């Protein structure tokens, strides 16, 4: 298996610097040259940087001229992309990809890099439980509310990621420059009444990880 | 909207509202404001619009309470700045949901049932039912229930209303009392 | 020093054959290798076809790469297209730089119509302690995507602080969330808040009550 794990994303003020990492595993790192690709949801995929297997040759996309610098550490088997003098037009998801001569064969999961003036905002976490008649219905839907966070993204896990089947994670709505979304689980009434159901909300930018157990609504 | 055809009898008095400012009791029948003849809710909705499109900033209020007409003073809200009086219509005390295995389920209360009395005290709103059970101290409370829809010219008939005896049980986690009745949405 | 040309929106029937085009702007297309990539909703891109026509095993043996030298185009041919083939597709080539296509969103038609399922949640007591009250209307299990969502307050149209998300696909049906921001004062103000969703003519509505159990 081939693993490419990014790190060093989040919010950075325009004109300032940010260094991205990509730790490779599962192959001979020195034998293969590697690269960096970013994705704007509008503009699409943009090649940013490459590096030779030795690390001799440093190639850059003419989309950004002499602002970024690539470097590899064949000891730690890692990428380093220093990004100096940034603009809001650089706000994208930054992937690291291994090359196999004529293409990229494997991609990382990428990191959302946001270049904004605005400060990072920690989200509020609220449980959502039905206020209607707790019926004998052998199914019930419970959800977690993530209100007012900046910027993208967040990830929600249920019972630390145990409950996966019957989980929907709804897209974020942008209102007054703050994101808000809801993730929901759908478990039987036998599950909720006996064992505890909790969601694990995580926001990298604000470095927050709050957990909220869904409790039946009393009066 | 069903409430526009019924008379204006105040059910809920909002907190920090203009109606609460001049102390409106939950059960005042507004017949006259400044203006304007108030017979249904549709009248008051049209009245509140035609008091801000006029630009009137001060008015008087007339209501019925215990059979008498009061003459209170009140401030006109703006229907363009997002203001209202702060009164909700009768939240009619009909059973919406019965919790499965509840002390009400153990007797035989169904949804669609209208509760008329609580220990021989007549109720008008759902909140009134809530209040009269909130301080039931977990003692045997009895209800008088009207069940089903009545045919025309028979809704004013003296029928044998089914009276049920309930025992309000405690809450396993928190430790409050619930008979297990949800309101109609 | 060149850009690739891709159709943005492409639709095919389920169990059909679709050819996806990747035309090179300027220069000989044969002179450099062309690579295809698949990307699902938010996930990482995958190698579909590398080295023009060669295919990494594991990926279904129904994808095939093709170069039409006369038209100066690249072709991704998906025979017997399935629902799991519904994703974005990016073609990729190089010379002295590396440039991708504009993106192709292959949307698979053939799923039978499905009416939305509405799940509504009141504000948490944790939220109410902050004079804030958000209503959550989750709409799931519907096809196609086009829906019209609005809120009602006692059967009265309200468009004050309504946040409705763009419907995006999940399993094989789209999901979309709806939000109504109110004050704790505004929450106790009414007696019934309705979530109204219109989909292919049909309109399903569910409501939340501020008044609670006894």
Curated annotation (Swiss-Prot), chain B:
One Gene Ontology cellular component: plasma membrane
Main location (coarse class): membrane
GO molecular function: metal ion binding; metalloendopeptidase activity
Record keyword Thylakoid present: no
Keyword Metal-binding attributed: yes
Keywords: Cell inner membrane, Cell membrane, Hydrolase, Membrane, Metal-binding, Metalloprotease, Protease, Transmembrane, Transmembrane helix, Zinc
Family named by the database record: Belongs to the peptidase M50B family.
Name of the protein: Putative zinc metalloprotease aq_1964
Full-protein interval shown: 117 to 291 of 429
């Amino acid at each position: 298996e081939v693993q490419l794990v990014e790190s060093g994303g989040g919010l950075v003020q325009p004109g300032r610097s940010l260094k991205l990492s990509c730790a490779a595993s599962g192959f001979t790192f020195s034998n293969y040259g590697m690269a960096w690709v970013r994705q704007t949801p509008t503009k699409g995929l943009e090649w940013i940087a490459s590096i030779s297997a030795g690390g001799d040759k440093t190639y850059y996309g003419d989309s950004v001229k002499g602002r970024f610098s690539i470097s590899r550490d064949n000891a730690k088997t890692t990428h380093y992309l220093q990004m100096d003098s940034l603009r809001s037009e650089d706000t994208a998801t930054y992937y690291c990809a291994k090359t196999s001569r004529v293409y990229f064969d494997y991609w990382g999961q990428g990191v959302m890099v946001t270049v904004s003036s605005a400060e990072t905002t920690a989200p509020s976490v609220y449980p959502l439980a039905p206020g209607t008649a707790l019926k004998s219905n052998s199914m019930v839907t419970l959800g977690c509310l993530v209100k007012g966070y900046f910027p993208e993204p967040v990830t929600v896990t249920w019972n630390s990621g145990a409950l996966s089947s019957g989980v929907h994670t709804f897209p974020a709505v942008l209102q007054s420059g703050l994101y808000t979304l809801t993730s929901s689980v759908t478990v039987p009434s036998s599950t909720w009444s006996s064992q505890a159901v909790t969601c694990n909300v995580a926001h990298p930018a604000s470095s927050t990880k709050v957990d909220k157990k869904i409790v039946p609504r009393e009066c | 909207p069903k409430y526009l055809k019924e008379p204006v009898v105040v059910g809920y008095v909002q907190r920090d509202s203009i109606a609460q400012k001049i102390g409106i009791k939950p059960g005042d029948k507004i017949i006259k404001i400044n203006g304007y003849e108030v017979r249904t809710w549709e009248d008051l909705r049209d009245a509140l619009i035609r008091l801000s499109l006029d630009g009137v900033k001060e008015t008087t209020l007339f209501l019925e309470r215990n059979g008498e007409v009061l003459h209170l003073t009140i401030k006109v809200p703006n229907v363009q700045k997002g203001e209202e009086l702060g009164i909700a219509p009768l939240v009619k005390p009909v059973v919406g949901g019965v919790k499965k295995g509840s002390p009400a389920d153990q007797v035989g209360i169904k949804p669609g049932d209208l509760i008329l009395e609580v220990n021989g005290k007549k109720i008008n709103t759902w909140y009134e039912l809530v209040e009269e059970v909130r301080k039931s101290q977990g003692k045997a409370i009895k209800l008088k229930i009207l069940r089903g829809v009545a045919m025309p010219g028979a809704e004013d008939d003296v029928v044998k209303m089914i009276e049920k005896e309930l025992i309000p049980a405690k809450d396993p986690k928190t430790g409050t009392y619930f008979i297990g009745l949800f309101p109609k949405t | 020093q060149f850009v690739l040309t891709q159709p943005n929106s492409v639709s095919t029937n389920l169990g059909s054959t679709v050819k996806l085009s990747c035309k090179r702007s300027t220069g000989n297309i044969g002179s450099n290798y062309v690579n295809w990539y698949q990307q699902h909703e938010g996930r990482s891109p995958t190698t579909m076809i590398y080295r023009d026509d060669k295919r990494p095993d594991g990926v279904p043996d129904r994808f095939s790469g093709s170069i039409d030298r006369s038209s100066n185009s690249a072709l991704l041919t998906i025979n017997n297209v399935q629902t799991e083939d519904e994703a974005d597709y990016f073609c990729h080539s190089y010379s002295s730089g590396i440039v991708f296509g504009g993106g192709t969103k292959l949307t698979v038609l053939g799923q039978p119509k499905s009416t939305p399922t509405l799940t509504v949640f009141p504000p948490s007591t944790e939220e109410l302690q902050g004079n804030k009250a958000t209503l959550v209307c989750l709409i799931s299990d519907f096809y196609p995507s086009d829906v019209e969502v609005a809120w009602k307050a006692n059967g009265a149209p309200i468009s004050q602080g309504v946040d409705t998300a763009n419907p995006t696909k999940q399993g094989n049906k789209y999901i979309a969330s709806s939000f109504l921001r109110l004050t704790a004062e505004q929450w106790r103000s009414r007696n019934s808040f309705t979530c109204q969703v219109t989909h292919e003519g049909n309109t399903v509505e569910k409501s939340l009550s501020p008044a609670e159990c006894v």
